[PDB]
Amino acid sequence: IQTQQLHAAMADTFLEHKCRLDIDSAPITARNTGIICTIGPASRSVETLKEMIKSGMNVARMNFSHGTHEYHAETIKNVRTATESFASDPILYRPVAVALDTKGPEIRTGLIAEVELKKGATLKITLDNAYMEKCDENILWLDYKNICKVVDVGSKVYVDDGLISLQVKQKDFLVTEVENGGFLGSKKGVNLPGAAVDLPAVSEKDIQDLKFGVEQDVDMVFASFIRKAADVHEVRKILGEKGKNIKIISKIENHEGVRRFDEILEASDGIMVARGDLGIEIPAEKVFLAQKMIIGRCNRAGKPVICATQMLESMIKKPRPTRAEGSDVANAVLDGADCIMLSGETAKGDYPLEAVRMQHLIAREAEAAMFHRKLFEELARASSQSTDLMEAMAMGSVEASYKCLAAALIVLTESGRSAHQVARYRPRAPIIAVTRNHQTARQAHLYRGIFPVVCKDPVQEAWAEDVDLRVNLAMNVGKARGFFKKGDVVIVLTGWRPGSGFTNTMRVVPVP
Amino acid sequence: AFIQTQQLHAAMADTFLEHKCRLDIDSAPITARNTGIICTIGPASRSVETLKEMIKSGMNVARMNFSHGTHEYHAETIKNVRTATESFASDPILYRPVAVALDTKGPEIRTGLIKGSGTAEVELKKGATLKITLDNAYMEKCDENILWLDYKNICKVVDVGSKVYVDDGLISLQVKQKGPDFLVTEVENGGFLGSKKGVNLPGAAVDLPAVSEKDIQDLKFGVEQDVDMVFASFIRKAADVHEVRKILGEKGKNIKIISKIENHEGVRRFDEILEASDGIMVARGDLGIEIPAEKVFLAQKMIIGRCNRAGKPVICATQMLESMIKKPRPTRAEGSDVANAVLDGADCIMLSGETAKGDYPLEAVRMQHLIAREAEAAMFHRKLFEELARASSQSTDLMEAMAMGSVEASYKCLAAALIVLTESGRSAHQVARYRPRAPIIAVTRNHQTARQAHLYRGIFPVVCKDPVQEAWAEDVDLRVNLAMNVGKARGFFKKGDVVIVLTGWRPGSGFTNTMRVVPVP
Amino acid sequence: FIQTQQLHAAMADTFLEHKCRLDIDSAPITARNTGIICTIGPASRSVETLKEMIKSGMNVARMNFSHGTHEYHAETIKNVRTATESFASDPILYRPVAVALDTKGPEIRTGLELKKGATLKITLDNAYMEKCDENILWLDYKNICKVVDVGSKVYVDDGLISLQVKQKFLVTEVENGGFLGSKKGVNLPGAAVDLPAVSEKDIQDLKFGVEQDVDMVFASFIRKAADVHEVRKILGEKGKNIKIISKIENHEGVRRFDEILEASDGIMVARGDLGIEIPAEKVFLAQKMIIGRCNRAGKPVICATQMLESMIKKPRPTRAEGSDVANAVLDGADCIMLSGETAKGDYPLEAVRMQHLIAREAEAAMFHRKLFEELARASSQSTDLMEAMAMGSVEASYKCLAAALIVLTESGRSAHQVARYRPRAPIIAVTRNHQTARQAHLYRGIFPVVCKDPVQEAWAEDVDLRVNLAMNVGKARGFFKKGDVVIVLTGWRPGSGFTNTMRVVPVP
Ligand code: PRO
Ligand code: PRO
Ligand code: PRO
Ligand SMILES: [K+]
Ligand SMILES: [K+]
Ligand SMILES: [K+]
Ligand SMILES: [Mn+2]
Ligand SMILES: [Mn+2]
Ligand SMILES: [Mn+2]
Ligand code: NA
Ligand code: NA
Ligand code: NA
Numbered sequence A: 001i002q003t004q005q006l007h008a009a010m011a012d013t014f015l016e017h018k019c020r021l022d023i024d025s026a027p028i029t030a031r032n033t034g035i036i037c038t039i040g041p042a043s044r045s046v047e048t049l050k051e052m053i054k055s056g057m058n059v060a061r062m063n064f065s066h067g068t069h070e071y072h073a074e075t076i077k078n079v080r081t082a083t084e085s086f087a088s089d090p091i092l093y094r095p096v097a098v099a100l101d102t103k104g105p106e107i108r109t110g111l112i113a114e115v116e117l118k119k120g121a122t123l124k125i126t127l128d129n130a131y132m133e134k135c136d137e138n139i140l141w142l143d144y145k146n147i148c149k150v151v152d153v154g155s156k157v158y159v160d161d162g163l164i165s166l167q168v169k170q171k172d173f174l175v176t177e178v179e180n181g182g183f184l185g186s187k188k189g190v191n192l193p194g195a196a197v198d199l200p201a202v203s204e205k206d207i208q209d210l211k212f213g214v215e216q217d218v219d220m221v222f223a224s225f226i227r228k229a230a231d232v233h234e235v236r237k238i239l240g241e242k243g244k245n246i247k248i249i250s251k252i253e254n255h256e257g258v259r260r261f262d263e264i265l266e267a268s269d270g271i272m273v274a275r276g277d278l279g280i281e282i283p284a285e286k287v288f289l290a291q292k293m294i295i296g297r298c299n300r301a302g303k304p305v306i307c308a309t310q311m312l313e314s315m316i317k318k319p320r321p322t323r324a325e326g327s328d329v330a331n332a333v334l335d336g337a338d339c340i341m342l343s344g345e346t347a348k349g350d351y352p353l354e355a356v357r358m359q360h361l362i363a364r365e366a367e368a369a370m371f372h373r374k375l376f377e378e379l380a381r382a383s384s385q386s387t388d389l390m391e392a393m394a395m396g397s398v399e400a401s402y403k404c405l406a407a408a409l410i411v412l413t414e415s416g417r418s419a420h421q422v423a424r425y426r427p428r429a430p431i432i433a434v435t436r437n438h439q440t441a442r443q444a445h446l447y448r449g450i451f452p453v454v455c456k457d458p459v460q461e462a463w464a465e466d467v468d469l470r471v472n473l474a475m476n477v478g479k480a481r482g483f484f485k486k487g488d489v490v491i492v493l494t495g496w497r498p499g500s501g502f503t504n505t506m507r508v509v510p511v512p
Numbered sequence B: 001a002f003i004q005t006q007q008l009h010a011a012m013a014d015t016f017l018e019h020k021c022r023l024d025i026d027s028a029p030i031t032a033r034n035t036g037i038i039c040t041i042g043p044a045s046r047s048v049e050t051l052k053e054m055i056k057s058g059m060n061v062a063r064m065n066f067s068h069g070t071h072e073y074h075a076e077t078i079k080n081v082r083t084a085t086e087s088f089a090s091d092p093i094l095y096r097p098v099a100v101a102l103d104t105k106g107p108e109i110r111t112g113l114i115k116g117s118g119t120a121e122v123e124l125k126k127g128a129t130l131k132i133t134l135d136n137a138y139m140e141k142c143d144e145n146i147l148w149l150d151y152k153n154i155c156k157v158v159d160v161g162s163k164v165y166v167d168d169g170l171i172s173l174q175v176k177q178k179g180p181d182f183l184v185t186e187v188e189n190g191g192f193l194g195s196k197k198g199v200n201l202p203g204a205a206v207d208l209p210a211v212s213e214k215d216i217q218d219l220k221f222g223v224e225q226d227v228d229m230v231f232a233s234f235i236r237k238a239a240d241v242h243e244v245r246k247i248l249g250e251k252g253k254n255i256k257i258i259s260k261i262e263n264h265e266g267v268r269r270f271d272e273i274l275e276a277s278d279g280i281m282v283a284r285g286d287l288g289i290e291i292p293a294e295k296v297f298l299a300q301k302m303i304i305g306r307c308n309r310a311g312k313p314v315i316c317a318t319q320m321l322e323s324m325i326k327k328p329r330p331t332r333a334e335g336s337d338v339a340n341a342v343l344d345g346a347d348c349i350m351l352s353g354e355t356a357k358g359d360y361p362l363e364a365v366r367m368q369h370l371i372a373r374e375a376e377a378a379m380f381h382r383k384l385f386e387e388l389a390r391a392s393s394q395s396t397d398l399m400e401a402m403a404m405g406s407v408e409a410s411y412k413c414l415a416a417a418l419i420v421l422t423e424s425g426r427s428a429h430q431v432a433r434y435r436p437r438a439p440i441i442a443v444t445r446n447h448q449t450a451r452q453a454h455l456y457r458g459i460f461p462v463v464c465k466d467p468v469q470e471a472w473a474e475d476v477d478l479r480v481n482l483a484m485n486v487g488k489a490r491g492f493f494k495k496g497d498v499v500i501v502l503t504g505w506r507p508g509s510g511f512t513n514t515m516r517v518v519p520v521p
Numbered sequence C: 001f002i003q004t005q006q007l008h009a010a011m012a013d014t015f016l017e018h019k020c021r022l023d024i025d026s027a028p029i030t031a032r033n034t035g036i037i038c039t040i041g042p043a044s045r046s047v048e049t050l051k052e053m054i055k056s057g058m059n060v061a062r063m064n065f066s067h068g069t070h071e072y073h074a075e076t077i078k079n080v081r082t083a084t085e086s087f088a089s090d091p092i093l094y095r096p097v098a099v100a101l102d103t104k105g106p107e108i109r110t111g112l113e114l115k116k117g118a119t120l121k122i123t124l125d126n127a128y129m130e131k132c133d134e135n136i137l138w139l140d141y142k143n144i145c146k147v148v149d150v151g152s153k154v155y156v157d158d159g160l161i162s163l164q165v166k167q168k169f170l171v172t173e174v175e176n177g178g179f180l181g182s183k184k185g186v187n188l189p190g191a192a193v194d195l196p197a198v199s200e201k202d203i204q205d206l207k208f209g210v211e212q213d214v215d216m217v218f219a220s221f222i223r224k225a226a227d228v229h230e231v232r233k234i235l236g237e238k239g240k241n242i243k244i245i246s247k248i249e250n251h252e253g254v255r256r257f258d259e260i261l262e263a264s265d266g267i268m269v270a271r272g273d274l275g276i277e278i279p280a281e282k283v284f285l286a287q288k289m290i291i292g293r294c295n296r297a298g299k300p301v302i303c304a305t306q307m308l309e310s311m312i313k314k315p316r317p318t319r320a321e322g323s324d325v326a327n328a329v330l331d332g333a334d335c336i337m338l339s340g341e342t343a344k345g346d347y348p349l350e351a352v353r354m355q356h357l358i359a360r361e362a363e364a365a366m367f368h369r370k371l372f373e374e375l376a377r378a379s380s381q382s383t384d385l386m387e388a389m390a391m392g393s394v395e396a397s398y399k400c401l402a403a404a405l406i407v408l409t410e411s412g413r414s415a416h417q418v419a420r421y422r423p424r425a426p427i428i429a430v431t432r433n434h435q436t437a438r439q440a441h442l443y444r445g446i447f448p449v450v451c452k453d454p455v456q457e458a459w460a461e462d463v464d465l466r467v468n469l470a471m472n473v474g475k476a477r478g479f480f481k482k483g484d485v486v487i488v489l490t491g492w493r494p495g496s497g498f499t500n501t502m503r504v505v506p507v508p
């Protein structure tokens, strides 16, 4: 029994490949898929974040749909306090990125406690701001003022993560009938599929939240409800000069987002399949189509793509996930997502560490299960119009890593660019990317297979010696992490001279 | 639009059919010619002044056919080759190494001399009786009634109704009666018989020695004359290779043994021959007589296939531009034969009569050169590369990894060349194996390694005459710039183009473990 | 134990493993799918010779109208039919034979020994057309001086001699030289020649072909779509069922091939003149591209010229000629052609037999699984029902190692679709249309069988009768025997405009 699903790897067809998947074929130790965790009251303590980091967390997400600047700043500080609790040991230190997830053009309800909305029983949507806090089973207020100009006779309104549904019967108010009932809570989200919502891509709140992200030196923004390239560019404008290096990950979570997908991709730095609202804005049975289309097209462009939301939902209450949840994580990884995400499971659930641990474990099994040879061939075909020198290095290196079954790839990188181009070509072996730039190290977490290492050492006067310094750091990192041992082979990627604008030098080195 | 060079639009096809359908006559080929060109030297090409023009036309390997000629003759030819080759040595940047190969007589069956009385040749007529004798009194008195041949033990291997073939299988006899010391035959295929013509017995187990006393002396003489390779005739099994090896011995251990496949038995036992050999020749002339002629292409394609799979050199040989012995231009089939052989994957292609005795030896050499570049571009590299990888994928060898990584990287940035620093040749050899479309400029201080490199598709050997620089860094750099200068002068690339450079990181390495993309300065 | 028909290689995953598995000890099947077209001249024109020509494998008789009179070719055509019809007593083993008129077209030619670097006077004066000399040569091109430049080259006699234009009458310097003779072909590569595409000498020959009941025209030096439409206009209403095979033999033919292919009913790679018009080292490029594009559109393609050239004087071919034939079949050519080999050679019978033997070796050595998959993909925009039925039948033939496909057809179009998808098993095509059966020899695999019985009362009875005739033909010619499996394509009801019914039927 070969490890790392290598028998399946040798197969000629996809059918064969699958018939060959073996439960007794141990994954390797390295974990290539990044894990993004929404932080909240279950996970907001220094103490729990230490454990979250140890469990697998690479990126911490701040959900700006709730909480004040004060509250979010403290959390950020808590994440950093915990991340830095490991700073003294360069061999084990894990950078941890901070992510800002914006509110965007949300429609939420008001205050009431709880109220029940029965199947068939009429309900009245109003915008009269006197009822902001006087909602019940007769009267329902939401904060979207122009709701009336955008919906038709026979339109549907979904309330509370799509659980409750309503049909608009007559016309600054709407009178609806309950189609799908439930219990109605305070400040629950509202969706209007088929309606072309005209709230700003970026509201005042958003603008203040984005500016705040700048001040807080966040590494990336998760931009909610992006519909078009112009939305992305608005977000880019607010971040401005001081924040030019923060990556904009666009959230695809409505029909228009999907329609205009190519342009959003081009304009953005990465993408998030935000399946929550997506499954409400379009039929839920269609979501997998979008997941797969998006991940595919992001792989093709070499830009990070994140599969999110409800991936291990039941784990909010139970210590073990469901069979559907297991399969969902694996398939997201087989689809080619760079990152997978936890929301409620870590923000508020009863088993936050467990959820992180489960993602870590499923990631490795599915990583080994990919059909690397065909995937490599297909990505090469897709990028074949480009003759880029760094792509050439990356492909040669990856192909080199497949042939000799290298234990890792070692990339020296300042901008991160060399590392990213290696990642996009999907080697099985982890990419240990050594960098003197802390932000690059943090942002590298967006890319499948990059294990970032911060090098704190001063630069040596001799280039070769400074280079050897950084490779040996990765050698030491790779060994403490159980990636390799003395006598294994790794691919190494460096600049020949200090002026080399990319890793133009590849080597097969034995691990010392 | 822009029409891409080197059939690069056809290179991007997803199917073999679309690749065919994208082939473009207006897609100009590159200047590098990757297919090694082997020329049989003879009266047509022996002079020093003609050999120089053979080199300028593209000859990489001069072949000495030991079925004819004394040692005094071949030593003069080999001298002439080296005189011609060294006339160019004054320009290290332009000088082209030239390999010397010894093609052995082997277990050949030949007829005698036609008698003086009568016509120059005889007419063997369909339905007429011809007797075959071993009586040495007729060895120079052959005619229509009585034919002498040199296989003394012929009577022990043929039967009544056996077929004896004569003169490149143009003339066939059927054995009608068997005598102890003679055969009575009937002519099935008529024709005009000259002297010392080739005889084949396809349905017979010929007991002649794989390596005869003549071959032995011929081999030893090969060793004393510092030939780079041996083309061993009529190799039937592995033990035939081991015998040639034994004879070449310790002194000739770096001499490459190319096994010539030309009988059914050599095709049946090909694998054990390949393992034992340094390379193979599809020696089609005899093969097309021993097995049915309509079956030769199957064997040719199987062999070229299996040597590609194994990383061993293969040569397509025989009658490729045959008509150019008397005509300035080839036929349309001949043009196709050269191209399809290159497409098959042949590392080298060869010329026999076309350079040995022909009227147009320079024009023959030039034509192979021009076809080879057309077909080299017309190959389906992306699919060739994928399929060679799959067949070798049980190997995790480090040099193959470097080789695969370098070729892949050359496909992606469309490198103008791969530079390879090598002493034994192994590093270059393994790159060649994986079939980049760019040329492989191999730099070596080992002169023999340079000459042997012609056996491998794409390797453009370059002799480094400079002393070993003290710092390993400067010694590597020196050998890169040489390849840079060679490349530029030869028109393979210019400033601003990109090459893939393969080097050793430290002196100790036993293979190129360093790959770079580097701009030409 | 070795599987027949290269079936071990048929099972390879990659192109390389397919090559590596090719087995000389793997026996080919009896049937031969690549059509043999044979140029008929003084060596082959007699009835007795022609009978053996048909016996050895000739399917198409080609008359070359570059030479000879209407009276001469009429005698040749007359002898072809006599030979052919001498077999008509046995409708089982009778082999239909097709007659092709190959047009002179826009030739240039000399009148009635040249040293390298010697000056030669080219003139158009009709006072020299019978006394051509060392220093004065006459040709029949009038516009020549308007289409050639200083420095441009002119080639004489199958491109053997080269002469560079030095001054405008034309004075030239010989480059390559040899023995010069009577009425020798002239080529002007890369100079746009403006001779009529279909001359008066052509329009007379084409009309002759209609009257002479020929099945296909091979239209020489086809440059563009217009040119095919001209040959099509000339053939007129009476000659509408005659197929037009356009001959690709100059740079523009290749340049504009696509519009030509759409306009033509088939294509010949006319290699001789092509290897004179473009660098000869490029010919294989144009050959493979062309065959591929024809394969794709499912229009017949003939590979032609010099395939067995040395057999003009020798009983056995060179290895380069062997190789050429097999690679032509592996390329995908529907038909292969002999010229000088059968027209004037010393061994026209042996040349036919070697094309036959070479064909069957190479036909088995095709990589059918990959070829089918690649044809389907390229034709995937088409949803045509006959194509659907064809593809399903070929697929079914592959899966059960079926001994043959039996196709019933009047237009031939159903059989043409089957052939196009390249089964390894032969296609027995039964037709009451004598001209359909003759034109079928243009398509890979199609073994046309003439039905001479009248249309039966019951539609089902008429189908069984035709299918049983196809079984009888197959069994007599050793394609299959009792218990073998065949794919059988028929129409369900009389009015079906194609074979909509497919069966796996046992051979009785
Ligand atoms: O460094 C890590 O742990 C993760 C692995 C994939 C992206 N970054
Ligand atoms: O260097 C040369 O000229 C030839 C080309 C490939 C093999 N050697
Ligand atoms: O019937 C025959 O013999 C040939 C086979 C291919 C075309 N016609
Ligand atoms: K949000
Ligand atoms: K020999
Ligand atoms: K003609
Ligand atoms: Mn959302
Ligand atoms: Mn031989
Ligand atoms: Mn022609
Ligand atoms: Na970089
Ligand atoms: Na004599
Ligand atoms: Na070496």
Ligand code: NA
Residues within 6 Å of the ligand: C408, C409, C410, C411, C412, C413, C414, C497, C498, C499
């Ligand atoms: Na039909």
